[PDB]
Amino acid sequence: SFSGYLKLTDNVYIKNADIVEEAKKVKPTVVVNAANVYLKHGGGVAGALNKATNNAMQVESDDYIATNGPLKVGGSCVLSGHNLAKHCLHVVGPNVNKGEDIQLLKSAYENFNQHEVLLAPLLSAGIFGADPIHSLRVCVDTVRTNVYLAVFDKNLYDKLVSSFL
Asked: How many domains does the chain fold into?
């Protein structure tokens, strides 16, 4: 199971880790992808997870979109975890570089409550342009299930921990 995490709350844990390497190691029931509405896994967490699946995540995703159309900002779908996890929960946080409403970050994190335990990134962080400190606050104030957060950047990990509360 999960090792090396700092406990932030009753249900939120955090680790300075590459979510791809964490998933490959742990192979959790659920890994969260920082998806976009098109499930186009080009960069950031999504590009990295998809590359680790040898593009099988993208091929599955393209079939999902062809069948169902795009997700909503704030929404999710459950697809295969391929080699990384049993399931991948593809969650769309707002991309504030695209002018999406930051208020939808809470809606995005509510999707986590449908799963008892998840490996996840901070939604809307990194290339999605939101303040990771805000993202962690919304995470702890929204998610009630057990969520293991992987933070790639060590300087940001240290900032998140040192400013928590």
From this structure: 1
Provide CB contacts within 8 A for 100, sequence distance 6+: 73, 94
Please give the Cα distance from 14 to 150 (Å, whole number). Answer: 6
Cβ partners under 8 Å of residue 107, min gap 6? 74, 75
CA 44 to mean position of chain CA atoms:
11
62-65 contact pairs (CB < 8 A, 24+): 64/39, 65/38, 65/39
Q: In this structure, is the dihedral angle defined by the CA atoms of residues 120, 124, 126 and 131, taken in order, positive or negative?
A: negative
Q: Distance from CA of residue 71 to its chain's centroid? A: 15
Cα three-residue angle 27-43-60, rounded to 5 degrees: 55
Q: How was this structure determined?
A: X-ray
Q: How many residues does the chain have?
A: 165
Range of the domain at 151: 1-165
Resolution as reported, in Å? 1.1
Burial class (CB in 10 A: 0-12, 13-18, 19+), 116: exposed
Of the chain, the end-to-end C-alpha distance in Å amounts to 27
Answer yes or no: are the C-beta atoms of 88 and 81 closer than 8 Å.
Answer: yes
Which residues have CB under 8 Å from 59's CB, separation 6+? none
